[PDB]
From a paper:
Human [name] (hCEACAM1) is a single pass type I transmembrane protein expressed as 12 alternatively spliced isoforms that all contain an N-terminal V set fold of the immunoglobulin superfamily (IgV) ectodomain followed by up to three type 2 constant immunoglobulin (IgC2) ectodomains (A1, B, A2), a transmembrane sequence, and a signaling cytoplasmic domain. [name] function is triggered by intercellular or trans binding of the IgV domain, resulting in higher order surface [name] oligomerization and subsequent intracellular signal transduction. In contrast to other immunoreceptors such as the T cell inhibitory and mucin domain-containing protein 3 (TIM-3), programmed cell death protein 1 (PD-1), and programmed death-ligand 1 (PD-L1), [name] serves as its own primary ligand, owing to high affinity homophilic interactions of its unique IgV domain, as well as an important microbial receptor. The displaced CC′ loop forms a cleft with the FG loop that exposes the key residues F29, S32, Y34, V39, G41, Q44, Q89, I91, N97, and E99 critical in mediating homophilic [name] interactions.
The [name] mutant crystal contained two copies of a hCEACAM1 GFCC′ face–mediated homodimer in the asymmetric unit. The first hCEACAM1 [name] dimer comprising molecules (a) and (b) resembled a WT homodimer with RMSD of 0.7 Å (over 1482 atoms), whereas the second GFCC′-mediated dimer comprising molecules (c) and (d) featured important conformational differences across several beta strands and loops with RMSD of 3.0 Å (over 1655 atoms) compared to the WT homodimer. The major distinguishing feature of this second [name] homodimer structure compared to that of the WT was the increased separation between interacting CC′ loops (10.0 Å vs 3.7 Å). Further, we observed a considerable decrease in hydrogen bond and weaker hydrophobic interactions at the GFCC′ face in the [name] homodimer, consistent with a less stable and less interactive GFCC′ face that possibly reflects an hCEACAM1 IgV monomer–dimer exchange transition state. Interestingly for both of the [name]-containing dimers, a considerable metal ion electron density (4.0 σ intensity in the 2Fo–Fc electron density map) was observed at [name] molecule (a) and (c); the density was modeled as nickel (Ni++) that was hexa-coordinated by residues H105 and V106 from three neighboring IgV molecules found in the unit cell and crystallographic symmetry mates. A CSS of 0.0 was calculated for the weak GFCC′-mediated [name] dimer (formed by molecules (c) and (d)) consistent with a monomeric species whereas a CSS score of 1.0 was calculated for molecules (a) and (b) consistent with a dimer and thus suggestive of the possibility of both hCEACAM1 [name] monomers and dimers and furthermore, a rapid monomer–dimer exchange model.
Residue numbers in the entry:
A (entry chain B), B (entry chain A): 1 to 107
């Protein structure tokens, strides 16, 4: 069952958090992470295509995010404006896609 | 900008609606249609793979839906329950995606 987890859940301003991804299904084109609680293009952070290991930023990219081959997202030098929810969308090769929403709190 | 237009917007019960698609982006991998206002997997009608030309039903498929290679969706035998919003997500090859949401009303 596709989920995320925030490491740590409570993040000091300036510090870092890892959004870790469990249970990626088989046969993927790629990954798409978003800010907020849904897949929304205006709030896309990064697109990652797995056969080419190419990452492409979206409208919400700050420059402080790093996406990994297993879908995990590290954000560095966390700001109060990074607080709350994020969404991962996993794109399957039949286009029947899966989403996972997680969150952390900046203090 | 990606848009959809319902043809016709106003549908008699038991008739047909074509959700047309304007301004597809470049270099894409496939399409995803959903019931409602968001790209939620649990409300996915259909995923269409442009590469292979293959449509896979999602969970919200009723057997009345037909997707065309240009992303337009046909809903046949419409009921009073179908009035509302429908969302396409177009999955691009750099996985940085776009959505557009339209609607129809059944009398
Ligand atoms: Ni009415």
């Amino acid at each position: 069952q596709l989920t995320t987890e925030s490491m740590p859940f409570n993040v000091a301003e300036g510090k870092e958090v890892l959004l870790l991804v469990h249970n990626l299904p088989q046969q993927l084109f790629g990954y798409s992470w978003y800010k907020g609680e849904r897949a929304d293009g205006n709030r896309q952070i990064v697109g990652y295509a797995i056969g080419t290991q190419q990452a492409t930023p979206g409208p919400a990219n700050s420059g402080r995010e790093t996406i990994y081959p297993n879908a995990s997202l590290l954000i560095q030098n966390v700001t109060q404006n990074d607080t709350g929810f994020y969404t991962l969308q996993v794109i399957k090769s039949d286009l029947v896609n899966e989403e996972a929403t997680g969150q952390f709190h900046v203090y």
